A paper describes a structure:
N. maritimus, like most archaeal cells, is encased by a paracrystalline, proteinaceous surface layer or S-layer. The structure shows that the S-layer is pseudohexagonal and consists of the repeated interactions of the Nmar_1547 (hereafter, NmSLP) S-layer protein. At the sequence level, NmSLP is arranged into ten immunoglobulin-like (Ig-like) domains. Collectively, our structural data reveal that the S-layer of N. maritimus functions as a multichannel exchanger for ammonium ions, featuring negatively charged residues that line several pores in the S-layer.
Our goal was to solve the structure of the N. maritimus S-layer directly from whole cells. As a result, we produced a high-resolution map of the N. maritimus S-layer hexamer from intact cells. The central region of the S-layer hexamer in the map had a resolution of 3.3 Å, with the resolution decaying to around 4.5 Å towards the periphery. The subtomogram averaging map contained sufficient details to enable us to derive an atomic model of the S-layer. The first eight domains were well resolved in our 3.3–4.5-Å-resolution subtomogram averaging map. By contrast, the last two domains appeared less ordered, with the local resolution decaying towards the C terminus of NmSLP, away from the centre of the S-layer hexamer. At the N terminus, the C6 symmetry of the hexamer is broken, revealing a distinctly two-fold symmetric central pore. Each monomer of NmSLP in the S-layer adopts a rough ‘cashew’ shape, facilitating several interactions around the hexamer of NmSLP. Although the amino acid residues (37–1499) from the first eight Ig-like domains could be unambiguously built into the subtomogram averaging map, several unexplained densities were observed, emanating from surface-exposed asparagine residues. Another notable set of unexplained densities was observed near the negatively charged amino acid residue side chains of Asp73 and Glu74 at the central C2 pore, as well as between NmSLP monomers around the hexamer.
Numbering used by the authors:
A (entry chain F): 37 to 506
B (entry chain B): 1013 to 1373
C (entry chain A): 435 to 1012
Write the structure that this text describes.
């Protein structure tokens, strides 16, 4: 129970684990140094003994973002275009902080700043993409690299960083001397400080304050034992929304933002060029255009993903010609029925796709998007705020036929069936005399299509198929 | 001290198939080691679909040597080279099936241990311990009907010998170290003694010691049995067959074709199996579909049969004489399988009751 | 063992002792019987593997430091050491255009997957200007190959190829496990490989066959002794861990040579990228799997299941010598015996592996797990444990002796051997395919005809000892005594339950691991009798008849009885009327 230091990866639900290219937000919510008009000093926050540069925000909290150097480099190796996918921006040497950010960052293993390069020298400028094999970086960055930037804000792993404290009088930008203080669109903030961590080895975040230090221990290891998928019910009626709750720590790349992932889950599209894949930030958390889609299937092996970062969907277990699960456009997705031919209907899940990224997420491939329930809860769901799922049982589904959804290589069967109802009239007394309203009780699990809301019968609602009548 | 034991005191005589004989196709065994169906199941020629499968009985050899139990709670194997000898003796002549304990290797069959070189003998590999804390090692070895001493009584079948070495030829030298004597063929007869030889590397005195166990080949007659004599048409017939020589493996319960039994009545004559007349096998609806042995070491075969209301395009009548006859091919008087063709039948009655008709007035 | 180092602080030296511990591997079932679809813990107490008192040590085949791993095997799987101690070398160069690694691809085509392997070697810059030889060792139980070589990790180091020969193994040593999928009634071949220790970006594996020596290798442009010597298996896989189903092309190519099988040797080839650093010890594990049966498949001689299973035990605590694992096993049934997915769906290398069982292995043949150990004395004595996996006699019965029209009959099947997963709910659908002989029967579309009936037939419901099936296909044109067809008559009568498939009757397990399946349907008033069952699709009668008075009988086909064989069991009931 810390008082001031809060770490994003600290989570009793997932036992403080951390994995993959996760960027870890470190916040020091301390009432003693919350003011932003005085020339206050930087709090002494270190991880594994290495100092972590902190920037004060307009909310009076000091912020600092760190990640593993090898994982960050491997993830940025998949950023074909800037500000898309697991893009960490541009890496620079740990000695380049003074020239670029205006303050020393020697004690780190490299900084990832959202600059872009116009004069791509082999010595004086960092790596826009980063080495796919990982390892230490020696490319340096200088002031002229900043002055030659043509686009600021290429970082896509920290998208909602708070505004640095504006410079005024005796106070500099962030109280440490950032050159440009525009958040989420500038070249300095946010920036990630990379550190060398050992898989299966603990990570200790430390805050040094008077009266007693505060330390948090994180474990940097594969987290497949916690990646689980659950379904709201067991039997599903003909048109009921299919709700998926993906409790996976690895998918929570951005701590300060809700994360969106896209999967190609078609397990039976036998096209040679097609494979099951995952994509990052295709859409925003609001359902807008989130950027371009980039390949990650061949990179997950190096990203500490032991059978816990892929999604594939089976729509017909018995192959009886009756599909069970299909997909729709939602408020958190931009799905489009490319195959708009009148011969087929919305049941043909292979007719849906994404217009902007038809190269891999085109017709077929079953593009499935998931959004995090919260910014840092690490739990993702297909269903949106309007309760409209991404998966439906087909209206013409045959009874008994079932489909299976696969996550963490743990198949989850989606059965189709019903329940015996019993309508009873219970008078308040032994005689039903005139002018006596008596309750009517109907017990039918088939009409309970949502476990988190109240379902009211309605003649005007075609979804409510069956209504009692007299 | 080492000890060797055999599963059963007696063992049935193994039988082969048509493909193991070079003789032309015939409607009768003609003295061959063949186990076909009763004559009505064969159409002028015995082919591969109308005879019992290969009858290589699988004998399991077991030894009780605590010395080889080096690990009290771990896997152990008898790694002593050629410590176990399996042989078949018929009077003054002996033939060895192979060797066990050394590394598994390909080899032929030696007669009387004449081959001095041991590398040319077939090796069954190292025996495996039955349980981590038992100390008893069991090896499963199957004996073909050809793995026996040469005799002139078996010239009735121009036997084709399956190769035990790397060659694919069917000649005599492929399976045995030497060819059989002219006018004689390798085979096993009734009354032959099956013996197992184990050489203990260390007895209670810590020296070499030889222990033996013996079994005798035999052939017995087959007899049918039923839970009752009369049966209502359409009821359940508990057809029980008790005959020892079909218990080829004591560790498992084998199955044998129901076609061995035949339906004999006024309605029709058919083998009641897949080789019978059209619509026959459906009429009985066997459960199980074939003769099934009661227990792995019992030798008694039982099957549930329904009495048909109609055999083939005609009904079955009340009081009809039901004859269930099957040919053993291996009776007590048979020196080997396919020598004597004795048949055994059973009488079954159908229900008879007064079909009285009455009126109200 | 016994040599110790003295570390001294505060002038109170403490002695760092090196040593070993007596292990004890135990299998503890949750109950008195280890039935199918029941994951039971495996407990291993070994202080030798607890090499860190402040962390958790997890066993790993890919980790050379983890020397000893428990293993379980059935039959005679083709491991890397079936032909003795192998010989492995490393090579740097280019494959060229006349090589199966670049031109070949996985397409189940003879030209695509089978070809010739050629290479050119440029090892001048290497140490001693020679091919990278290595020291080879094989574990007795896990069968892991440990490669010892120079631990050169320079930046200039670049290696691409790797050729390994399986000692004296030949096509004869491979055909005992690898079977011809075209000739066997049921048979599948699987290839499991683990090359995670290499750390290669992409991994490609090919099978080599030649009548001469493998080391040194030759080229097509040099000699033409062998018509074909390359059989591609894996092409540029992004995962070093993979358990893939071999295509029929590999099985055909195994038997695709007319030369003597004993006169031709076998070699295994590797092509990979991003492996420019090699550690002191490297581990290579890649075996062959095979399952299925031949002809009638009732006897034990024709039932085979060749596989090797390794358990990835995980340490319980930071300083606890107790390593905990678990074992899963599925008992194959008549439905999944013809589906390769159930064999490919098992995990050979995991913390909770699973394996196939073909027969009620008890007594001396019970599934036994093996684990070597260095005892306190210093010997490498093995410790093993076994647990029986017997079968059960399936019992099917109905809730009542008599039933009315639309009485909602329910079928209760209790047989623990059909539970193939303790996690998922086991279900059995009904076949809807007129072409297959198992139409309107519980099971799978695939079906083979044998002496015991149909392979794909699991459960059937019969009225008057006649299977209840819906009229379909081209054999339902009969109209009977009137001009109305049976299907049209049923439609006019309003009976939408024209058959078992129409009702949607399927078997669903009561729980995750209950092992009891419950299914139900409503008895229709009118049903169409099948005129004859001797043809596919069934030829139905031209007129329907009311089911009242007829006896309704079910038949659950039990693939494995208590003794572990096929026994036909069912129950009987009558459709009552008032």
């Amino acid at each position: 129970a810390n008082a001031n230091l809060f770490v994003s990866a600290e989570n009793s639900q997932f036992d403080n684990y951390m994995s993959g290219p996760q960027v870890i937000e470190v916040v020091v919510i301390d009432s003693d140094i919350n003011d932003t008009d005085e020339a206050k000093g930087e709090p002494d926050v270190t991880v594994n003994g290495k100092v972590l540069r902190m920037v004060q925000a307009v909310d009076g909290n000091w912020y600092g973002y760190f990640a593993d150097r090898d994982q960050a480099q491997i993830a940025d190796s998949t950023a074909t275009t800037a500000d898309s996918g697991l893009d960490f921006g541009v890496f620079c040497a740990s000695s380049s902080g003074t020239a670029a950010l205006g303050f020393s960052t020697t004690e780190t293993d490299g900084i990832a700043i959202p600059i872009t390069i116009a004069n791509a020298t082999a010595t004086g400028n960092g790596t826009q993409t980063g080495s796919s094999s990982g390892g230490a970086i020696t490319t340096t960055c200088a002031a002229n690299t900043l002055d030659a930037s043509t686009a600021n804000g290429t970082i896509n792993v920290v998208r909602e960083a708070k505004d640095p404290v504006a410079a005024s009088g005796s106070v500099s930008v962030g109280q440490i001397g950032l050159k440009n203080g525009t958040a989420n669109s500038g070249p300095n903030w946010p920036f990630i400080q990379l550190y060398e961590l050992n898989p299966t080895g603990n990570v200790v975040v430390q805050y040094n304050k008077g009266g007693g230090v505060q330390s948090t221990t994180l474990t940097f290891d594969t987290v497949d034992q916690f990646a689980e998928l659950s379904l709201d019910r067991t039997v599903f009626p003909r048109v009921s929304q299919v709700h998926a709750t993906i409790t996976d720590l690895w998918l929570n790349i951005d701590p300060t933002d809700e994360d969106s992932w896209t999967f190609a889950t078609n397990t039976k599209n036998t096209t040679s060029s097609f494979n099951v894949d995952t994509f990052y930030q295709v859409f925003d958390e609001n359902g807008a255009s989130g950027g371009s889609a980039l390949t990650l299937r061949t990179t997950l092996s190096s990203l500490m993903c032991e059978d816990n970062c892929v999604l594939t969907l089976d729509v017909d277990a018995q192959s009886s010609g009756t599909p069970v699960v299909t997909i729709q456009d939602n408020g958190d997705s931009i799905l489009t029925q490319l195959n708009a031919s009148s011969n087929t209907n919305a049941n043909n899940a292979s007719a849906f796709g994404i217009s902007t990224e038809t190269a891999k997420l085109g017709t077929g491939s079953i593009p499935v998007t998931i959004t995090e329930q919260g910014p840092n809860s690490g739990v993702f769901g297909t269903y949106d705020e309007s309760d409209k799922s991404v998966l439906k049982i087909t209206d013409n589904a045959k009874r008994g036929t079932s489909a299976s959804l696969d996550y963490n290589e743990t198949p989850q069967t989606i059965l189709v069936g019903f329940s015996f109802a019993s309508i009873d009239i219970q008078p308040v007394t032994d005689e039903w005399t005139s002018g006596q309203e008596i309750p009517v009780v109907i017990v039918d699990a088939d009409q309970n299509k949502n476990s988190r809301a109240d379902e009211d019968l309605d003649l005007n609602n075609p979804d409510v198929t069956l209504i009692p009548a007299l | 001290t080492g000890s060797v034991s055999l599963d059963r005191t007696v063992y049935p005589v193994p039988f082969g198939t048509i493909a193991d004989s070079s003789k032309a196709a015939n409607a009768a065994p003609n003295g061959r080691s063949v186990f076909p169906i009763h004559a009505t199941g064969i159409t002028s020629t015995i082919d591969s679909t109308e005879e019992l499968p290969t009858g290589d009985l699988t004998i399991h050899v077991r030894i009780n040597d605590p010395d080889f139990d080096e690990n009290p709670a771990g896997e152990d194997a008898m790694d002593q080279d050629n410590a176990l000898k399996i042989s078949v003796i018929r009077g003054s002549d002996s033939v060895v099936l192979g060797y066990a304990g050394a590394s598994e290797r390909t080899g032929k069959i030696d007669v009387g241990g004449n081959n001095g070189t041991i590398s040319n003998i077939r090796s069954f590999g190292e025996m495996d311990e039955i349980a981590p804390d038992a100390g008893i090692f069991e090896l499963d070895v199957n004996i073909k009907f050809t793995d026996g001493p040469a005799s002139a009584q078996c010239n009735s079948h121009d036997t084709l010998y399956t190769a035990l070495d790397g060659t694919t030829g069917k000649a005599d030298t492929n399976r045995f170290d030497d060819g059989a004597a002219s006018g004689q063929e390798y085979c096993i007869l009734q009354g032959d003694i099956l013996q197992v030889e184990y050489t203990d590397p260390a007895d209670a005195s810590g020296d070499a010691n030889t222990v033996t166990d013996s079994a005798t080949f035999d052939l017995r007659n087959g007899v049918l049995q039923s839970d009752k004599s009369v049966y209502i048409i359409g009821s359940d017939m508990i057809l029980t067959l008790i005959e020892p020589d079909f218990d080829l493996d004591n560790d498992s319960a084998e199955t044998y074709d129901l076609d061995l039994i035949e339906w004999d009545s006024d309605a029709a004559t058919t083998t009641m199996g897949n080789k019978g007349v059209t619509g026959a096998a459906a009429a009985f609806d066997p459960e199980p579909t074939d003769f099934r042995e009661t227990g792995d070491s019992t030798g008694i075969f039982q099957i549930v049969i329904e009495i048909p209301e109609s055999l083939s395009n005609d009904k079955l009548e009340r009081g009809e004489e039901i004859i269930l006859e099957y040919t053993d091919w291996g009776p007590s008087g048979s020196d080997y399988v396919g020598d004597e063709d004795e048949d055994v039948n059973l009488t079954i009655y159908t229900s008879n009751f007064g079909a009285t008709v009455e009126l109200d007035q | 063992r016994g040599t110790s180092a003295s570390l001294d602080y505060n002038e109170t030296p403490q002695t760092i002792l090196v040593g070993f511990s007596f292990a004890s591997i135990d299998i503890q079932p949750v109950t008195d019987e280890w039935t199918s679809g029941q994951e039971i813990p495996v407990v291993i107490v070994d202080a030798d593997q607890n090499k860190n008192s402040r962390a958790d040590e997890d066993l790993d085949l890919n980790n050379p430091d983890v020397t000893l791993i428990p293993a379980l095997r059935t039959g005679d799987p083709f491991t890397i050491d079936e032909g003795g101690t192998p010989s492995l070398i490393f090579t740097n160069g280019t494959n060229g255009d006349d090589s199966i690694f670049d031109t070949g691809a996985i397409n189940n085509t003879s030209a695509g997957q089978v070809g010739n392997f050629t290479l050119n070697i440029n090892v001048t810059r290497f140490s001693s200007a020679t091919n990278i030889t290595s020291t080879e060792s094989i574990d007795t139980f896990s069968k892991r190959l440990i490669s010892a070589q120079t631990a050169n990790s320079s930046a200039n180091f670049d290696v691409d190829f790797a050729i390994i020969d399986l000692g004296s193994a030949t096509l004869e040593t491979l055909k005992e496990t690898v079977v011809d999928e075209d000739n066997t009634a049921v048979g599948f071949n699987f290839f499991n490989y683990d090359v995670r220790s290499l750390g290669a970006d992409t991994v490609s594996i090919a099978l080599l066959n030649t009548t001469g020596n493998i080391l040194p290798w030759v080229n097509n442009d040099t000699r033409n002794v062998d018509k074909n010597n390359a059989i591609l298996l894996v092409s540029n896989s992004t995962n070093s861990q993979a358990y893939v189903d071999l295509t029929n092309a590999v099985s055909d190519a195994v038997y695709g040579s007319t030369n003597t099988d004993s006169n031709v040797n076998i070699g295994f080839a590797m092509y990979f990228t991003g492996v420019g650093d090699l550690a002191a010890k490297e581990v290579i594990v890649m075996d062959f799997f095979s399952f299925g049966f031949t002809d009638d498949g009732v006897q034990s001689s024709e039932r085979f299941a060749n596989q090797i299973i390794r358990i990835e035990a995980e340490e319980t605590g930071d300083n606890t010598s107790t390593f905990e694992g678990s074992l899963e096993y599925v008992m194959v049934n008549q439905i999944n015996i013809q589906d390769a997915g159930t064999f490919s769906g098992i995990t050979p290398i995991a913390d909770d592996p699973s394996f196939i069982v073909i027969e009620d292995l008890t007594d001396e043949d019970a599934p036994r797990v093996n684990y070597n150990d260095l005892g306190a004395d210093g010997v490498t004595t093995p410790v093993s444990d076994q647990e029986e996996a017997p079968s059960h006699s399936g019992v099917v019965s109905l809730n009542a002796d008599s039933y009315k029209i639309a009485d909602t009959v329910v079928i209760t099947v209790e047989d623990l051997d059909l539970n193939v997963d303790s996690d998922l709910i086991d279900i059995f659908t009904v076949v809807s395919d007129n072409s297959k002989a198992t139409d309107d029967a519980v099971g799978s579309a695939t079906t083979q005809s044998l002496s015991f009936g149909e392979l794909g037939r699991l459960l059937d419901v019969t009225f008057d000892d006649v299977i209840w099936s819906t009229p379909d296909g081209a054999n339902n044109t009969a109209t009977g005594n009137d001009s109305d067809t049976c299907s049209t008559e049923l439609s006019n009568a309003g009976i939408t339950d024209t058959g078992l498939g129409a009702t949607g009757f399927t078997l669903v397990e009561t729980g995750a691991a209950t092992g009891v399946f419950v299914g139900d349907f409503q008895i229709p008033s009118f049903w169409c009798r099948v005129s004859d069952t001797t043809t596919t699709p069934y030829t139905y009668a031209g007129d329907e008849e009311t089911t009242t008075g007829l006896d309704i009988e079910v038949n659950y086909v039990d693939f494995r009885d208590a003794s572990g064989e096929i026994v036909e069991v069912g129950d009987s009931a009558g459709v009552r009327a008032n």
